[PDB]
């Protein structure tokens, strides 16, 4: 969850989830464009992200 | 001296219509295909327009109508209208 900033007319929130790889790179898992503030994920594995 | 060529014109004016000789007749707007088949009113604007090109309009009675928006802004609200009643849970 977060807070809405001072946007002019329309608010949309883009959410991008990345996972740190074993060697040190990044891995992209899913993306979303929503309007509600709170978001909930589900069925996450591995470690740091 | 003489003032000739009166050239009575009573006949020419009727050529465009007789009801127009007593009433200028109301103007009519044009039809935009893009606005489906709706007919634009010349004295009412239900839609709320943008405050820029449109001149400051005038009202003359009743007519729930739109407006010309000057500033729209969305932020984060406060939890509590006022007083000491400020519960959250």
UniProtKB/Swiss-Prot annotation, chain A:
Family recorded in the similarity comment: Belongs to the Caudoviricetes tip attachment protein J family.
Subcellular localization, as worded in the UniProt entry: Virion; Host cytoplasm
Highest rank taxon of the organism: Viruses
GN (gene name): J
Quaternary assembly: Interacts with host LamB.
General function of this protein: Attaches the virion to the host receptor LamB, inducing viral DNA ejection. During tail assembly, initiates distal tail tip assembly by interacting with gpI, gpL and gpK. During virus entry to host cell, binds strongly to host LamB in an irreversible attachment. The binding induces structural changes in the tail leading to viral DNA injection through LamB trimeric pore.
Official protein name in the record: Tip attachment protein J
From Swiss-Prot, chain B:
Locations listed in the record: Host cytoplasm
Stated role: Plays a role in distal tail tip complex assembly. The tail tip complex is assembled successively with three tail tip proteins J, one tail tip protein I, one tail tip protein L and one tail tip protein K. The tail tip complex interacts with tail measure protein to initiate tail tube assembly. The formation of the tail tip complex is completed by the addition of tail tip protein M, which is followed by tail tube polymerization. May be excluded form tail tip during maturation and would be absent from virions.
Native organism: Escherichia phage lambda (Bacteriophage lambda)
Similarity comment: family membership: Belongs to the lambda-like tail tip protein I family.
Designated name of the protein: Tail tip assembly protein I
Full protein stretch here: 134 to 222 of 223
Lineage: Viruses, Duplodnaviria, Heunggongvirae, Uroviricota, Caudoviricetes
Coiled-coil stretches: none
């Amino acid at each position: 969850r977060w807070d809405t900033p001072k946007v002019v007319k329309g608010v949309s929130f883009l959410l991008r989830l990345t996972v740190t790889a074993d060697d040190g790179s990044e891995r992209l898992v899913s993306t979303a464009r929503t309007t509600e503030t709170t978001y909930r994920f589900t069925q996450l594995a591995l470690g740091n992200y | 001296g003489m003032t000739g060529i009166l050239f009575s014109l009573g006949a020419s004016m009727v050529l465009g219509g007789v009801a127009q000789m007593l009433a200028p007749k109301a103007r009519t707007p044009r039809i935009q295909t893009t606005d489906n088949g709706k007919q634009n009113t010349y004295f009412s604007s239900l839609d709320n327009m943008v405050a820029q090109g449109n001149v400051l309009p005038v009202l003359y009675g009743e007519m729930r109508v739109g407006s010309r928006v000057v500033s729209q802004e969305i932020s984060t609200a406060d939890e509590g209208d006022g007083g000491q009643v400020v519960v959250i849970g």
